[PDB]
């Protein structure tokens, strides 16, 4: 309460975090339906840490509070608290979401993840591993059966043990290494080896343990090393195929397919004619050439990195023109990461 024109000395100051957002990382944090200390507003928008503490001022110890407070302290821009019941409708209404972050949530985010993937909304889910210690005599098939077999998701087992004693969901550890990667390296680079601060893995994980959980459904460990403290260690999705392994090459095409339709939605209701088809394929060639020359596409020439194709005997027929359709086909090569490094050693004494 400011009355006089002077200088006010208040001493109840709290922390603050500067926004260092990425445009390709706008997540959805799902909070549980049977949660008592959330506002009855089912969908709520948080652009920064200052708007989050005017609605949640006391520091809670729940799954949604420690996910968001770990989000905003690593940059992070606008984000959504959506109830578990309205996750398939908040993606369908708000047009901006790129990530579905299950912040300590099971079996209801999963069935609403597989709804919006079948509807085609170009999202990427970040699920959770078991909160309990996986034994080692447990089998990777019986442990990984809760999770969908779609290439739009990753699991991330080891939970967090935040420095204030609270427990961080491991989807929030994974989403805070996506913000720091989508600035400094881009969406085509893996979210793995970037280190997230202020968190600690609850369990020590060996690499004999991760070898069982890598092929098949890809658990995607969260491991700490000397030096690089608590990175996420793994970048594979929930299917082991030649195309849609590797979280980079799925999230690259999600960014390509969304930045192309944002460019081509300004060409809808144009006359379906041959001058309009040339304006489509030159708006995609101009997008993909800039994306090639910043390292996102694999190819040492523009003919090996992408192609755009549209015609009247190429991609669509005259009986299909008359329905208002405009079929463009676009193929483009992505860069696969390195995952294994073999150090082959020889020596011989005094030689």
């Amino acid at each position: 309460t400011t009355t006089y024109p002077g200088v006010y000395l208040s001493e109840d100051a709290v922390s603050s975090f500067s926004v260092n957002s990425a445009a390709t990382a706008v997540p959805l944090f799902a909070y549980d339906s049977e949660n008592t200390n959330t506002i009855n507003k089912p969908i709520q928008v948080f652009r920064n840490w200052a708007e989050f503490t005017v609605e949640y001022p006391t520091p809670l110890e729940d799954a949604f509070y420690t996910s968001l407070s770990l989000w905003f302290m690593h940059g992070g821009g606008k984000c959504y608290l959506v109830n578990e019941a309205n996750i398939a409708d908040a993606v369908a209404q708000y047009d901006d979401i790129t990530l579905i972050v299950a912040a300590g949530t099971d079996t209801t985010t999963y069935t609403a993840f597989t709804t919006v993937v079948g509807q085609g909304y170009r999202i990427f889910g970040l699920f959770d591993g078991p909160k309990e210690k996986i034994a080692g005599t447990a089998k990777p098939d019986e442990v990984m059966e809760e999770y969908p077999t779609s290439p739009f998701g990753a699991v991330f087992y080891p939970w967090g043990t935040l420095a204030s004693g609270a427990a961080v969901p491991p989807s929030a550890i994974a989403a805070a290494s996506i913000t720091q990667t989508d600035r400094t390296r881009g969406v085509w680079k893996a979210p793995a080896n970037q280190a997230v601060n202020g968190v600690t893995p609850a369990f020590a994980v060996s690499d004999d343990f991760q070898g069982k959980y890598n092929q098949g459904k890809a658990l995607n460990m969260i491991r700490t090393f000397s030096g690089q403290g608590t990175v996420v260690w793994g970048a594979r999705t929930l299917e082991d195929s030649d195309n849609w392994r590797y979280i980079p090459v799925r999230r690259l095409f999600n960014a390509v397919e969304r930045d192309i339709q944002k460019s081509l939605n300004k060409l809808v209701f144009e006359p379906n004619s041959q001058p309009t088809w040339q304006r489509v394929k030159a708006a995609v060639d101009s997008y993909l050439h800039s994306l090639w020359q910043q390292g996102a596409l694999a190819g040492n020439t523009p003919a090996d990195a992408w192609f755009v194709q549209v015609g009247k005997d190429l991609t669509m027929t005259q009986e299909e023109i008359n329905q208002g359709k405009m079929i463009i086909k676009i193929g483009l090569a992505a860069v696969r990461p390195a995952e294994f490094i073999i150090l082959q050693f020889s020596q011989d004494i005094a030689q």
Partner: protein, 149 residues
Amino acid sequence: MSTPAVSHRFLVNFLFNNIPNPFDIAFQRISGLSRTLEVSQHREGGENVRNLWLAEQVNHGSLVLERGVMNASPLTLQFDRVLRRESTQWANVVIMLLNELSLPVTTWTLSHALPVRWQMGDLDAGSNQVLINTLELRYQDMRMLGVKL
């Protein structure tokens, strides 16, 4: 004969011990690496027509770098720490030229490079130019690699 190497494509990789990730930073104007051997001339009594050069000590040059004032990288945050004397960490630098495809044709591979000088460009009211800052490192050893030596 194979075509000579042009000088307008180059990558630079840094590896500090403060910083856990190796980072790659684009520069404008890498200056050039010299390596002198520092001989000395001796004069003998009865010999007036030949010279005598005696090898002593290899002297390495300095790595002068130029780039524009852009967002804060892990290297301009690191010169800020060393020139404020908060750290004296040095890095292993790898510089390499690229051919038409992507391939490294020559590599220079500096060792224990220490940030020693920051130099800011001029602020002028009629100028029409990017603010370029000049960075300078002193390294201990140098080891050139590659197929185009």
